[PDB]
Amino acid sequence: TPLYTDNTANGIALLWAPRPFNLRSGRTRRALDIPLVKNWYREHCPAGQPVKVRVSYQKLLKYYVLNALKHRPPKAQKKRYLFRSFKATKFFQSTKLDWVEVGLQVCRQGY
Amino acid sequence: IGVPIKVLHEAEGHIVTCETNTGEVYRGKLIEAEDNMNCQMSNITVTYRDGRVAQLEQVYIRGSKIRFLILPDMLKNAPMLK
């Protein structure tokens, strides 16, 4: 076997990658539970920023510390399925629609 | 390698007593042992066939002439015998 291949340096560089780029297997996450801005106000304030941006960093970090401190484990319960009980009712039907058409149907039904 | 040789290396440092084909019984602290039964021992009480007791301080026994060895009794809890 040779000492190094083409995938050697990339394999070493992925060992020090952040989460989840250092992984190779996992579970999926629902799309609204993935913050894309969290590292940016979590690291530090850059130099030369105005006053209100620094205050915005400090208030977002305040909300993050409050959500971290007020966290408690959720209570055990029966698994919850509203649409599975809606599906067994004969008054509801299932279909496949475009997003824009059902988005118009929901707002006109609300009107 | 077999099981009794690992037991023989396990009994190094302890006082064993060996009898060889010439009927002589050598009791003392086992210093070194090999794959074959070449046993280097020290501080040896020597019993001959007639009954003379001698004190020989360094003995090296060839494994070919050995009838058997007698090992300490606390080796029944040794890991290779369990």
Binding site: - | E24, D35, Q40, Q58, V59, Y60
Partner: protein, 74 residues
Amino acid sequence: KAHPPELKKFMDKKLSLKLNGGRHVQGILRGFDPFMNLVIDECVEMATSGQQNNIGMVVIRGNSIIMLEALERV
């Protein structure tokens, strides 16, 4: 597969050997092989008669060797 005997502790020491028919001999160990054949310098005979006879540099085949005895401190 035949490993050499660990005889480095007994090199250049005065040892007495026992041989097959109740035989006894003495001398200085000078080396070995992995078949435990021994070279002995200053070899005195010392049979069961009790009289001592020096020979010199001799070779003992290992098959008749019963025991070594280190007269000198190792």
